């Protein structure tokens, strides 16, 4: 929680910093450097826009989530339930909060697909309050609400492709409305 770096792109004059922010963005969203699973880079124009200050880090981050590469890595191999928790991990830094959030993103996936889901997370108020427009998302250590810390911990203590299991398949309800 302390021994980390937060990539906050405060200027675009330093191209080395811009490139460092970009490569951190790839590592955050895709969980590692892209070279061993791309042929050629499909993000070059996106990097050009960020580097030219035409977009912000938030737009770059969403551009990564709506890319074909992201779809291949973290949508096609897994069911929509697991897509949700990997989504919040990569873009919000945490496991899903509650069943309402799982419901909310399950409807988006069921009706509009992957790009709508990414757009919902990154454009939400929580994202802007936490990471804002200029900061690459990063792992969080939420205290509240209940179970968010241990669920986020289980998500971030696994290596990529470590297993094919759901950390948060759904929150067991305490009171079944209607049952």
């Amino acid at each position: 929680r302390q021994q980390t770096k937060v990539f906050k792109l405060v200027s675009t004059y330093d191209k080395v910093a811009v490139k460092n922010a970009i490569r951190a963005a790839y590592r955050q969203v895709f969980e590692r450097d892209l070279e061993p699973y791309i042929i050629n880079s499909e993000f070059t124009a996106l990097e050009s826009k960020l580097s030219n200050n035409e977009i912000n880090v938030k737009e770059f981050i969403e551009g990564l989530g709506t890319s074909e590469l992201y779809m291949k890595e973290f949508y096609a191999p897994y069911p929509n339930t697991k897509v949700i928790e990997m989504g919040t991990k990569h873009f919000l830094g945490r496991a899903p909060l509650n069943q309402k959030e799982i419901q909310q993103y399950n409807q988006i996936l069921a009706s509009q697909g992957l790009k709508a889901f990414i757009g919902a997370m990154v454009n939400g108020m929580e994202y802007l309050q936490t990471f804002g427009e200029d900061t690459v998302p990063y792992r969080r250590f939420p205290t509240l609400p209940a179970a968010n810390f241990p669920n986020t911990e289980r998500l971030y203590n696994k290596l990529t492709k470590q297993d094919k299991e759901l950390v948060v398949p759904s929150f067991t309800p305490v009171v079944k409305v209607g049952g």
């Binding site: 906050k8 757009g119 108020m125 427009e133 200029d134």
Partner: protein, 67 residues
């Protein structure tokens, strides 16, 4: 796709930040058409002032061929 180029000045309300913040305070950015309504609402709720909006990409009045 159609895209807006928007300028906005978003102030700080509940904190006195010490890092440099100009980049996230007064900025100009490209927003996909399908995100502008939501994005405009978000900036407005954060107290932001939308100072300029332009249709950077696309044409007004298109019925077919939005990409």
């Amino acid at each position: 796709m159609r895209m807006f180029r928007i300028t906005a000045c978003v102030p700080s309300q509940t904190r006195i930040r010490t890092q440099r913040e100009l980049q996230n305070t007064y900025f100009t950015k490209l927003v996909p058409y399908d995100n502008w309504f939501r994005e405009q609402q978000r900036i407005m709720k954060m107290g932001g002032k939308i100072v300029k909006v332009e249709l950077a990409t696309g044409r007004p009045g298109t019925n077919a061929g939005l990409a």
